[model samples]
Target: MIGKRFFQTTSKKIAFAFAIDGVLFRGKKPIAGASDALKLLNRNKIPYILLTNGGGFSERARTEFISSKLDVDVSPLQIIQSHTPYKSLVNKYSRILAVGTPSVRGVAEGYGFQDVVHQTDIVRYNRDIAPFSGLSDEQVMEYSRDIPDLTTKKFDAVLVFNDPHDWAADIQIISDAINSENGMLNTLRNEKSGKPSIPIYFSNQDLLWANPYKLNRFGQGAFRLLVRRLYLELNGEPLQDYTLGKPTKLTYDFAHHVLIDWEKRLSGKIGQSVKQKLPLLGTKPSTSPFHAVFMVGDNPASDIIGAQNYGWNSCLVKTGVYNEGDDLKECKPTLIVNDVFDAVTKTLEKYA
Candidate 1:
């Protein structure tokens, strides 16, 4: 079955989804042949998307950096960061407590989220609330803005856009908003629903992520863990939040929608196909044209397992979290390759 050339089918189409950090680059340095891999797909009119459980930057900002590093022409729309799907909920919430790096406030605003409030903005309301905030007074004031009606207004949701710089301050602030009566700040509810007064959304669930240091460090998942434990201790119930990112069906479905949209785009420029609806968060495509969607990624937990669960082919690369001798008992990929370049080479040679 591996010997069969996809070219024999002639009419069959295939697409790819890629993970950015491990597969394409480790931190700043580009993985060998990463650019060529992209160029290969580009030359053949193959559609692929950069799907990463990393954010804090806008979609355009992230892709622009990738474009510059990889020396490949990447469009802002061709990539999806962990927080990108939050765009769908822009209209659903009244005012959101946008949590993450300082950039997340602007990122939310860029995504059309009106009435957004950053964590710093809350600190500005009352510095006493976050006694041990990581940001110094000057730093907080530099990024913080005065929001009108800060005291009376209710936040409809808490959106964590990325890893926080101030875990202590965020944990304190988040606990306040979640336990606040009717989503108000600094007021606890007497009634018990086991659910936080307002909803919360975590962009990614990565427990650890790579840095320049020799060992991996705590990531947003660890933050989630801390928040959950504190909730359990206080409310006697587990915390509830919407986790979007790798290994979540919602994220895969979103990526699939983007892939299909990209394929339709290729059909217009490179060949011919009819217009179809773009992807929305809650809906799966009525029809999919891809013969097989390949997920080439570096991490086994997020990328490989995520693709396998979604019924897409997964090519695990050793360039990131997974090592050559690591046991595949928990989850397995369709195949293992050296890096993304080899994954592409092997995919084109055998599957594509």
Candidate 2:
């Protein structure tokens, strides 16, 4: 049972949040009432954001795509794609080798990196770094020209922005970076402490996603798994990669900031002071902790697993992954429902 204190005062409070695939819409078309449901919150001045582990473009482009699909207006503040969490690292590292197509342009712009290079862009420019150049040189030239000394560019991190279109190339390149001594592209710059340690980061951990084609496709998690396996096969020590999206604390922190903005806008009470601060276990509970949070997602592993394990409340919608009668053994979501719309209704009924 929810504590009485949680419901003591119904100020209608909610903070930065996002609707992933399956939870909001299935494929290309917006789920029935999904657009309206989100628009209602915007109209009501709710503090929310659209956070997606999925990416084929930057946050603005993705926001526009989602907004157009939902037939609503969206802003940069309302969207967070996979590479968004890595914005903090931009100052530390001027150059980045961004993996994935969508992230190619969007993440580059978001991070304010002038020399952001995508895998395809790398192939187009770097003839020496092209693994597939021998096979598809003409095809690549049709899109982009290959350049030598491409991998010579120094990198600070190998960011798997989202699902990779060319998994083999990404794994190969990331593996090379990991083996580098100083995080140099090709040469592993070894020092007293050993090679340059370039950090690896991933946005979403969803192993698989339900696409509009009614099919299951590999997500970032799957690609990372493959890269890890390849690294192991090379007799290399295990390298860690950070993930930010979904129920992760990184995502919660971002969402919390947005939530604070919502509260200020709705109540028109700016700079309200609070003496007491909310306590969070493992990691701090976002910017401002919420007594309750209703995370709605379709995938059990990402949505239910992250939310269930999170300090906040978790709700799983059946519209995405779980079969109606299938026994969900590992990820037992707090509350299961039909769709995002239903999920919202249930949150209101239980908390409102």
Candidate 3:
């Protein structure tokens, strides 16, 4: 029952995990009825999380942008960007070289990373690192970060948080760092073993993404491929790196855990309560179990495959890169809808 005084005691166990790019908005503009769908969810107090393969900004920035565009209040906890799972690696490496855009370093730092360095920082310290054709040494140094004893600093890991803003410079820096003896910049290691000495991780594996423009734009996956190819060319060895985001087991598990926590939080606000019990009697859990998570996305390879693999209910929307007729042998979505609005409507009708 819809409550008049701002609450309901009914079952809202279902969680709606939405993909941002194609479903909610194409580029900057919001899709038709997108705001209305979010409004409905907030009104009903239905727990939902925005899951996206895009990340070049901080979670707070993305949250604010979504809120402004959709005219809805979206919390940081309700968002799971491609790089959000990088928080799990905070303890793994102390110093990490975060590639991609200028905003990537801040995003990494927000995830509890101890030491985050970008290509610009490397260029600032050593102008010879990426001596491109057009940019002068002083011009490149303008965007560089000041690090004391920059030559001694060694990156423990290389992380690509999003699509690279300067692909040429970023790839060069990454190759240099990996080839450098123990992740140090400007120094190359002996390549008798023909393998990368340093560890590298890419946040998203999306090659192309849909936008308001007629042609699809290249994504992080394309940049990764280029980086890999360049590394392989530099050294006669196959470049190895960890891939995350949609379609990866680790990423899906992280999202599931986040959804579970968010579900319990929302459930607790209703009529649900927790209480202690005797040792022999055992405790009664008041929270309703999360039975299904409706993952609405446009990409069949990432979204559909990931949902099917993770046991989450999948719905494919046509408003994204995916069209009416596409081969889907491995990735089979549970349902198909016209757009995000239709998907939300069908999800509520079936589960709500």
Candidate 4:
């Protein structure tokens, strides 16, 4: 009887933030009931957004592909990828050194960066810069392009968009850019400020991530480690940089605003044609519409702990890295459900 009154008076609706990797699809295969869960949210008109730590392509392209795979309609704006916050820096920097997969060049340019330079471009300018690079002639033609002012150009910032395929070359190139004289390539700074010539942003600090292989593989966190160690060696001090992904309040705050914006878009208060209101990095939203926001995911440290740290509700599902009978050392979730679908069903039932 008391529960009924509380449920009835709770006019504020619930919002959801879902991690894509283990919550929806385990790489290529969509988890059971995942589609149904999204459909349930759609039918009930509940607002939700995918807050994921994965990105290597354009937002529209990636979301479109995810929509096809999951058999659910997902708007590109509804997804907050690991590197999504980098979009906020579009107007802040010019001549960006975009690191990661070759596709990231298109992604950066698509985000409106004025002068985007790829790692391969550095390699192409001088192969001896990274003597260990093993790029084939065909790969050089396909991945690397000519930059006319390679010699005189200076990058304003280095953005690590995703994990690089070539660690040998990428580390060398990135190290050169950071240790360069005022962002100039191949020119070392004589000063000992312990800071880079510009800035470096790592999308996520995941040391190891699951893959098709039997063992977990080194991820961008590993790459970050290599870069930091190399930078420390070069400057005799730690590297000063920025990280914009899970397990940090910075990314969650960005995700919170994203969900709020989606609600506005749904209510038609913010027109579809309105320009996106990018959230300032590290700043928290003063207000939120949802009564209770839930972050559902598979990883405990990142998904659960991050959500808990940000004061958002967390739901741990059994679909991804976490398993039955497993122990979590970092933190516990607000609720534990079987899968993505069950997580939604249980939460909705609690409030209803």
* lDDT of each residue in 23-117, candidate 3, tens digit only: 89999999898898888888777788888999888877999999999999987767888888777788888898888677888888887898888
Q: Measured by TM-score, how close is model 4 to the native structure?
A: 0.91
Per-residue lDDT of candidate 2, residues 1-352 (tens digit) = 1321123236646542545677777767677767766776566555566666776666667778888888877765566666666666666666666776533655565667656666666555555664643427564655443434455667777777777666566666677776676666567544322222677777777787777766677778788788777666664455566677775877666555555554554466654443212222234434563556666777777766666666556667666666677666687766788777666655655775
Q: Which candidate is the best by lDDT?
A: 4
Record all residue pairs in model 1 with backbone atoms less than 3 Å apart, i.e. clashing: none
Task: Check candidate 4 and list the clashing pairs.
Answer: none
The segments of candidate 1 whose C-alpha lies over 4 angstroms from its true place after superposition are 1-9, 269-278
At residue 222, what lDDT does model 3 achieve? 84
Q: Judge candidate 2 at residue 311 and give its lDDT.
A: 55
lDDT, each prediction: 0.83, 0.63, 0.78, 0.84
Ranking by lDDT, best first?
4, 1, 3, 2
- The predictions' CA RMSDs to the true structure, in order, are 3.2, 5.7, 5.9, 3.2
> Across residues 1-352, which tens digit of lDDT does each residue of candidate 4 receive?
1321222335677989999877898667777888888877766567899998888898889889988887778888789888889988998888998998999999999888999999999888889998988888788789989987777877899999998788899999998889888888779888765788899999888775554444556778788999999899878889999998888888998998888888888778888888777888878787888889989988886788889898888899987777767778877798898999878877877754
Model 3 has an lDDT value of 0.78
